[PDB]
Amino acid sequence: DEIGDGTTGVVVLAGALLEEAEQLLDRGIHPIRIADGYEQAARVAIEHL
Amino acid sequence: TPVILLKEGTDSSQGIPQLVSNISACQVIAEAVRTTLGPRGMDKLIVDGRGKATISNDGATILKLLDVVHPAAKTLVDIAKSQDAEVGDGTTSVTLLAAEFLKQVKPYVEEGLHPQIIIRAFRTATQLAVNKIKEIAVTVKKADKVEQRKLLEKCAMTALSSKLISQQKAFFAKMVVDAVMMLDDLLQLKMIGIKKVQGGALEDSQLVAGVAFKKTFSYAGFEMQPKKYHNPKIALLNVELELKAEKDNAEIRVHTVEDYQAIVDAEWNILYDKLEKIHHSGAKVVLSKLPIGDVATQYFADRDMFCAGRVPEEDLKRTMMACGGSIQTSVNALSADVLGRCQVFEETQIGGERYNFFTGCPKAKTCTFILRGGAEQFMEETERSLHDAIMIVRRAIKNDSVVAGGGAIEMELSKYLRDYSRTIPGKQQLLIGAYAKALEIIPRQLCDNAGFDATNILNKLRARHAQGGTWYGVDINNEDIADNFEAFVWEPAMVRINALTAASEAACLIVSVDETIKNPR
Amino acid sequence: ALHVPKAPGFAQMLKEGAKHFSGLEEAVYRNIQACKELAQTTRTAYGPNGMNKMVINHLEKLFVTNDAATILRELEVQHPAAKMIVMASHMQEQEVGDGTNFVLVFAGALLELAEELLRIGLSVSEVIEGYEIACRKAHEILPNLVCCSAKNLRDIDEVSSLLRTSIMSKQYGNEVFLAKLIAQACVSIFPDSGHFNVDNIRVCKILGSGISSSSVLHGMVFKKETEGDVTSVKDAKIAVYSCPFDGMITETKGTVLIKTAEELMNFSKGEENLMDAQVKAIADTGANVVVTGGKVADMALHYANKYNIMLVRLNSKWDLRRLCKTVGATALPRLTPPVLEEMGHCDSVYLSEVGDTQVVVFKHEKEDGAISTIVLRGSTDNLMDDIERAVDDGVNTFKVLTRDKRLVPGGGATEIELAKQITSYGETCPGLEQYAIKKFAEAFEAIPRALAENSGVKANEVISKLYAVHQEGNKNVGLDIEAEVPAVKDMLEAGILDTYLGKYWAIKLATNAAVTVLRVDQIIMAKPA
Amino acid sequence: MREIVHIQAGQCGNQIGAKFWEVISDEHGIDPTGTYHGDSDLQLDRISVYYNEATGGKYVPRAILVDLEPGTMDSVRSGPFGQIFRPDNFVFGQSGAGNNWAKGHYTEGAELVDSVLDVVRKEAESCDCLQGFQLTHSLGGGTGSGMGTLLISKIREEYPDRIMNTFSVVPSPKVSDTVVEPYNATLSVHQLVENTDETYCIDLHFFMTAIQELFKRISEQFTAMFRRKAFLHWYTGEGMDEMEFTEAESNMNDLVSEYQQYEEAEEEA
Ligand SMILES: Nc1ncnc2c1ncn2[C@@H]1O[C@H](COP(=O)(O)OP(=O)(O)O)[C@@H](O)[C@H]1O
Ligand SMILES: Nc1ncnc2c1ncn2[C@@H]1O[C@H](COP(=O)(O)OP(=O)(O)O)[C@@H](O)[C@H]1O
Ligand SMILES: [Mg+2]
Ligand SMILES: [Mg+2]
Prior knowledge:
This is part of a larger assembly, with chains A, B, C and D. Chain A is an all-alpha fold. Chain A has helices at residues 10-26, 31-48.
């Protein structure tokens, strides 16, 4: 409803974004630390786009 | 025996086992909301019997969503609603404090101590702790406009740091402060337009300086009239501008066909008389609670005039204190002083929805929040998080007194009570001393939620306070202690005063109960 | 094996499910057992050191209260003999208001002590006659023990120390603050004629900060908003109406009849212009605030806002009548302007928010009003109800002091002194009744026993010490509470006094309920349904 | 504003009346304890037509419950929404009519009815102005029909200028649940002809064909029963007579005539 294109591309990226965090949790990493580092990366990719 | 006193099924218990089993029942309520405290807290997920999920980090709504039936535990759920009605913040800090006042006095109950001695001791400590906060509460002289804006930004930023929107706490804290100075004296909570629109990003939320409401039902011809005006004149009405019967209780008895045709022309002349009176007044935008028929829609399309109908009552009242008109139930008096005015009016598209905007009001005394998220539960958690900074700033104007946080004020109180207990003799030492050891539950939970060493840190805080650093709290980014007053972690003094009185009253009530009786059905 | 058949006669003609208990070993000795169990349930809540009780009725509603009458009201009882003891306690609540636990303790000790007399040979008629003789003797000794009557019921420094005993018996610890609220409210509405009314004190509960934040307010308060736009008037003229604020319609089924086109155009304008004159007629009398009790009309609301008038709606009937006494107005059954005597003058009417609750306040600056309200604030819905009852005990004490100003020393100094004088009287009566009068005197020791057991001290030493001091002549010596050891203390100096009328009706109703149970011989119960 | 009251009689009348109060208490948001916790203004403008308010906010109904058997009173008391009724409005007997219309009309209905008029007075005293009565009874059982017929006759006499509506029930079309059902029905309809303003039947002012079928089948069984004079001594022995039953069938035939639907010797004239 916001754009109209890319609705099967978001669920693939979100699903692959959660899988990559599975290994970080098993090493003793707080989930809030992961959710904090993710937002910093999304500010680098958008400013690069 | 053959004739029995009470009904068959009246369960009854009493004694020492009755009271100890109540202390162990409040340990379950406090543990349901234990891990939602601090900047590193985690929210919960509850499901109803139908299948609707409610995802939240605040104590008040978590305890409302559990079907607690234990009579002793139902006191802890009732004090949470009291805290979110008086101050609106600190809800989950009175639940751990209420359970810690009962765990620390559990062994003394088993030894045979008269519970009246405990109640006298609890009331003596609360009055000595509430008075200590007011003695060391920091205030300022001549709070000027600049310094009175920084003070509320810091307080609103702290109430937001433990919520879902924690990365964008700087952006949001600037909108909440600006949204409360538009109000004048009573600071009504119904003058803020929380609206929720699906789609977008969390940084796309906007605050408007007027009113904004969704597009309502429209008839044929609605797309034939302009949707952008420069200086309109809002006509706030309460009338049905549609072709109908004059009165439900009416009857017409005509005799000749010449009078038949004049009746049909009389209904078309009544309606056209109302529309002409509106058009002569110079109005350009008209609104009405009652419906607007299609004949009136095509009347306003041929004269470049906007029309709307079936507006909710909560939205017309928000327009009035933003434009400056008045609701008219009759069109017989439309003067220049009963019309509204603004600077821009348009109808844009946001997230596949049509919204009307009324920005540009220099004398506006109301605002409206448009929230942009990505799911139904993303907006509800953002609205509940915004509802905490609203009430914190509202309470912070009537009381310009602040204290440091992050355990900095729990530890100064526990130091003052330990010194007081060593002077008075008797059994009051083991009761006041048990009150001081229960106030350090707040710093302990902050180091347990982040994953720290809760014992080594507390040994350092207890040494910095006994030397004489009054505002020395904890730090989660530095793995250490620091000065929380210079670190700009501030909170009003009214969130801790009401937290001790509510926690002390709930603990003193449970102790006094001797026996319980449950009746059948 | 063989089976024992049914005895011929009445036992063979009974309906199924019914029961028959006849005799002395099957009806009298079992009735005392049921009533002795009732006394052990409510005894724990006696005195300052009483304990609360968690009672849940069949609507899953929870009660945390310390009143004796409230506990019995929320407990179902299926024993007929225990039901008279309940109805004996509910009668003292409506006459006096305080002393519901005294009936249960006294009627529990008179009945139990009568069981021992029935095994040593004494008949039932000898016990009943012995108790009544003792009951009359106590009603003659009682007036001679009155000390420290009330001096002035309009002084705020004297009345506050007289209600403290009633409050301290229910909210220990908060008895100093709570006594200053009731005393501040009862003397304000006390008329010159002296006819005190209990319904003129109102209690409103707003979930808030704490007990110490409660305050009194000369006027009325409502849990409602304002219908119009005006929300503050400085000096208002209230015009109360009982009829709804709209056009007048006939009760018979009436309809309009339009036969010409010209009458159809003027009908809508006729009704509106008619309403403008009616609203403007009231506005010319200075009536800033109009209070209705019916349905407000959309057209009538428009003209109310035009002339800066305040419109408040109260759909509670009796709540409307209470406002007429506060402001001094009269309810108008018709929509006509009041003339001179139907305009109530207030001092401030405004809409304010108290603890997230938008309320309307009819504040008065004068202390001489008709109705005064008490705003109660607390943290739990249960804590406010418990304090609601404690306020009602203080108000009911003020009413009794209006009728009878005589007071007696409390704290057990009255029952022990009544035990010495009755015991000596029975020694001078030779016959079979002297055993019953002595047992009547020993029932007065159950009250000091209940105060000593609840405090945490050995009871037998307390009655031992009280009897020695009273023999010397000190009739104003009771039981100490603050002392850890079982000591004694003077009560007139300390200030613990009870009402003479409170105890006079307690003994009369307790003995009446105890002598009726003994008179019953046969019990014929029907099938429960 | 023209407040109305209700009267419930018999075993059948109590059961339906107990559930009738259910649709009003919940629609107006009246709590089972008698308090009010509604959140609308349309539930309070007409709250006084059916409920009488008490001090402190208690709203009690305006119903009177009468019966000749005490065993049917405690069912409503202990059931849902049974605590809100006025304790003084319960009127019960000890004998019972036992499907006897005449026993519940003159020989034993003449004592308890005097205990009902004194109750309807104290309720009618509190109301501002009343416009009518609502009564519920049956037509097959003599316990309710005989007591109701007398009760409905002693209400009109004291209030000759007040309307009164009934919600009576009617017997089954083909099957019959009592031997003397036709006897108990004919004697009760003719007493509702000139004593009622609107009646309803639940299975010229009769509502629910054109009711013509109901009255046709009743008089067919009644005529067959009266021809043999069967079970007639149960009614005549307590104070009736033969002519009383004749007026029941003669009047019953008149109402059928008002409800209109729309031999081998024919030679000369
Ligand atoms: N910057 C910070 N550093 C350390 N602790 C903090 C900081 N900001 C807030 N806190 C602590 O986090 C707690 C917030 O708890 P919160 O989840 O908001 O409870 P509630 O919702 O009941 O108010 C406060 O008690 C405060 O002491
Ligand atoms: N400070 C006190 N010291 C000793 N006795 C007290 C004190 N306050 C009240 N009492 C006694 O407690 C008794 C019982 O009071 P309470 O249980 O509250 O009501 P009730 O009179 O219905 O039993 C009173 O008769 C009074 O004499
Ligand atoms: Mg918070
Ligand atoms: Mg008392």
